[PDB]
Design a protein around this ligand. Structure first.
Ligand SMILES: Nc1ncnc2c1ncn2[C@@H]1O[C@H](COP(=O)(O)OP(=O)(O)NP(=O)(O)O)[C@@H](O)[C@H]1O
Ligand SMILES: Nc1ncnc2c1ncn2[C@@H]1O[C@H](COP(=O)(O)OP(=O)(O)NP(=O)(O)O)[C@@H](O)[C@H]1O
Ligand SMILES: [Mg+2]
Ligand SMILES: [Mg+2]
Ligand SMILES: [Mg+2]
Lengths: 346, 350
């Protein structure tokens, strides 16, 4: 007597069939657990596709969580991130080959291709191509920083409002979306947490988690401190207020601001140098300006100095050593840095 | 008063200067914590170059450990792995651009390019191309399995002998080295542990470390089990005997053998299907043959069946459910699977 076989259950999005998708060879990148490819959907829609790495422990489960968070964001924070177009799951015999333009076995996620750039790529080419991609009329460090940060903080505020902490905020995960007026959109919710029970928290736990060492505060690589109780539907709100996991994104946003504002900080080594000095002076911006900035003769901090040092003050708020002192992204959005020019004389 | 500052310090290998290295754009591969590129050294030496991923926590520390282990292996187990040519560290102003063909800021490792094809790539094209690249005269599944497993198990035995567990054994990390008669060499010591105090253990810790879930036993994703005194210079030798972390490599080598031996098992899907059934029948090879083999009518187990089922038995030894029952790579080497047949080659022998 043999065990019977049975159907395979596959996840699918209404309107999206495997036949509809052509994948383009050559990954745009590989992250911790997955690989991203360019694709064409229904003949003329430019999309991007992500699958799980076969060689990485738990990769499918990590992608499943990214999928869940993407659905949450699609429902609650439209426009903050790349437009989510759903999923497609394929079986063994029904899978093809990447180098032949067909989706291979396993779960795939799909988004609109929001643009061929990232802010990291653009800023490293220069403030000018960055401002052009952003449709930013004030093509200066100050101009791009004001526009970019208003957009990033606005989006982070909306994410946090619906319980999502992105946890991988950085220029490489921002695209200037030319089809939507150049507005910045976040990508990559692969490390994101849902910190409210809707119906349950996702990817949210005590202790250290995935982080980009350049953009996460070195002694604060957690959303919940290692001693914290595990989150439950009953304690989530208390934990949100107590441990302020959203302040993880605040620090990262401060790092983004530093790089947009100061050309010399756009390289990894540049920002790394600044942060080491910043830590050395006790996470005190005024201390850095007084004791350290003289050492940065090759750089220009004009965007941060402008208007009573408003840029520096906003960085200080986003980058306080203590979470309890660090500004929320929502609060930061109301900072003087973002004030409209008075008496413009049009 | 003003702080004086001072010079930068960069790590370098005698005889290897960044001006002599041209990097070719286009990552050969993206691993967990690093990126590999082809390069040309001194205008005519084909090399491979690896740096850390900027976006991965402690990728820096992992590349340093990979460096340390490569030095250990170069000193103690020459020929087992891709030839290690040392490191090159570049600073900020002297750092270049991959698109301009120059090494970027940070630490780089360099190895000889041992060949353009991995065993994974070859075996998937066919036993024929694989046998050719291996200089394997017996161009059958049995032939290539015998030659390849002899080489692999030999190298693993040597690595274990100097305290190194590779921890990422699979066809993708084997290259048939054209410039050394086609012999297999391991690549990628990025997950490797040095498990003895020589003078200090490296990348050796209790609990689940990194692992390719295809080539690691699903419930044995560790070298040392969460339950065991952290590795120290004093207990190292004891843990080795108690927890047998090298048996991690034994299981992986059994997986390689299965794939070399059975064409149908060369796809992820194929090997996955087998290991699931194998697991289902209690990690019992004979049970598999008895209860399941009939369901594999599309596959041909001849290489494992040959000579009283020697191949199947070696697979059983390498792939015992319990580490205490699982063969070491050294023990696996003397198995009957590797015996010359009676009067083998008699027709041309002098
Ligand atoms: N919606 C999108 N539109 C355009 N490009 C995208 C989109 N999503 C991702 N990309 C690009 O694909 C690559 C990786 O995307 P991401 O979602 O960050 O996954 P990843 O695993 O982190 N890959 P990588 O950035 O190379 O480490 C980057 O080049 C992104 O710019
Ligand atoms: N010494 C070598 N000679 C030739 N090819 C090599 C060598 N080392 C690595 N490669 C190739 O580079 C790619 C990755 O190398 P590896 O050392 O495994 O680092 P990795 O970060 O794990 N990249 P990958 O294994 O592809 O995910 C593989 O395609 C190998 O074929
Ligand atoms: Mg990313
Ligand atoms: Mg770096
Ligand atoms: Mg590898």
């Amino acid at each position: 007597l043999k065990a019977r076989g049975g159907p395979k259950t596959l996840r699918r999005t209404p309107g999206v069939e495997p036949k509809d998708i052509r994948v383009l060879p050559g990954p745009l990148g590989s992250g911790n657990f997955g690989t991203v490819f360019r694709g064409v959907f229904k003949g003329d829609q430019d999309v991007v596709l992500k699958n799980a790495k076969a060689d990485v422990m738990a990769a499918e489960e990590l992608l499943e969580c990214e999928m869940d968070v993407n659905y949450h964001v699609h429902a609650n924070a439209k426009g903050t991130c790349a437009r989510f177009m759903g999923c497609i799951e394929l079986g063994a015999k029904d899978g093809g080959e990447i180098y032949n333009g067909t989706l291979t076995e396993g779960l795939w996620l799909m988004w609109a291709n929001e643009g061929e750039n990232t802010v990291e790529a653009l800023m490293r080419r220069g403030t000018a191509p960055l401002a052009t991609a952003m449709a930013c009329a004030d093509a200066t460090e100050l101009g791009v920083t004001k526009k970019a940060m208003r957009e990033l903080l606005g989006s982070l505020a909306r994410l946090h409002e619906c319980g999502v902490v992105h946890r991988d905020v950085k220029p490489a995960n921002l695209i200037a979306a030319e089809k939507d007026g150049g507005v910045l959109k976040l990508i990559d919710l692969g490390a994101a947490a849902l910190c409210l029970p809707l119906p349950e928290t996702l990817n949210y736990y005590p202790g250290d988690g995935p982080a980009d060492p350049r953009y996460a505060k070195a002694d604060e690589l957690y959303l919940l401190p290692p001693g914290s109780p595990r989150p439950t539907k009953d304690n989530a709100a208390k934990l949100w207020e107590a441990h302020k996991p959203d302040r993880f994104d605040s620090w990262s946003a401060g790092c983004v601001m530093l790089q947009l504002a100061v050309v010399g900080l756009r390289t990894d080594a540049g920002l790394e140098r600044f942060l080491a000095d910043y830590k050395a002076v006790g996470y005190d911006v005024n201390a850095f300006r007084g004791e350290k900035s003289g050492e940065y003769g090759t750089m220009d901090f004009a965007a941060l100095d402008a208007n009573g040092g408003a840029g520096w003050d906003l960085c200080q708020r986003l980058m306080e050593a203590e979470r309890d002192a660090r500004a929320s992204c929502e609060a930061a959005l109301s900072h003087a840095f973002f004030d409209a020019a008075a008496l413009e004389h049009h």
